[PDB]
Symmetry: C3
């Protein structure tokens, strides 16, 4: 079973998050630029997206929180959604970031 | 239990949607620029994303439809997806737009 | 029951994918620009998003793989996620790409 992780964090935290995940065996991710409103009325943020095996989700979340948590407003948000199919277009094999 | 709302609407409807949601206690959202094809062959749209408590979803949908529904083609689309985890990076508490 | 398809493919494959889906009755889609890391450390990609009836998912996936599969690294990824509500803002009717 696969899951999707969506992480909304400050733009300048990309490198740190990437290397932290790479250290635990997770490398394939998608990144997009978005505007964050809530806590002009908005600030630029980046949305990091990855799809991986359910058993790898907990460690991935912990590592993201570790590099992004500072204790004050705006540290970001992490969402986990169910994925019914994860396909690697090349072979039809499963697309797992945790491989 | 949390849910995710994805709303695809015309770019110039952002302000109206934001204030309408703020009026019912929903403020934290993410916004991204996308191209909409379907009904050049595309028009710029904005994708509004929010994660909130399941009990707040119905009212949120109704308010979005209220400000965006005009009766003619292109009013937009609203999708609801299940969320298994909603985490506020700062404390590990739940990330609820409806608070 | 509705489902969401997220397809991450090379930027120059948009036209081919669009026409292939149009040939099988699927037209409404959203497209966004993202950065893909994994297999500078990234390359521009496009994320194609569509929400359609569960019975239309298999054929849609097959057609996307058909036009994008080349046999070598970077062909892309396809994810399927559950959708609890798909609403056409205009009438409140269901938003189905497969109509």
């Amino acid at each position: 079973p696969m899951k999707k992780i969506e992480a909304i964090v400050k733009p300048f935290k990309l490198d740190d998050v990437r290397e932290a995940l790479t250290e635990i065996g997770i490398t394939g991710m998608t990144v997009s630029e978005v505007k964050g409103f809530g806590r002009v009325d908005f600030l630029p943020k980046i949305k990091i997206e990855l799809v991986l095996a359910d058993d790898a989700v907990e460690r991935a979340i912990d590592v993201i929180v570790e590099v992004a948590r500072s204790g004050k407003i705006g540290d970001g948000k992490i969402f986990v959604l169910p994925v019914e199919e994860a396909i690697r277009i090349r072979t039809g094999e499963r697309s797992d970031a945790a491989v």
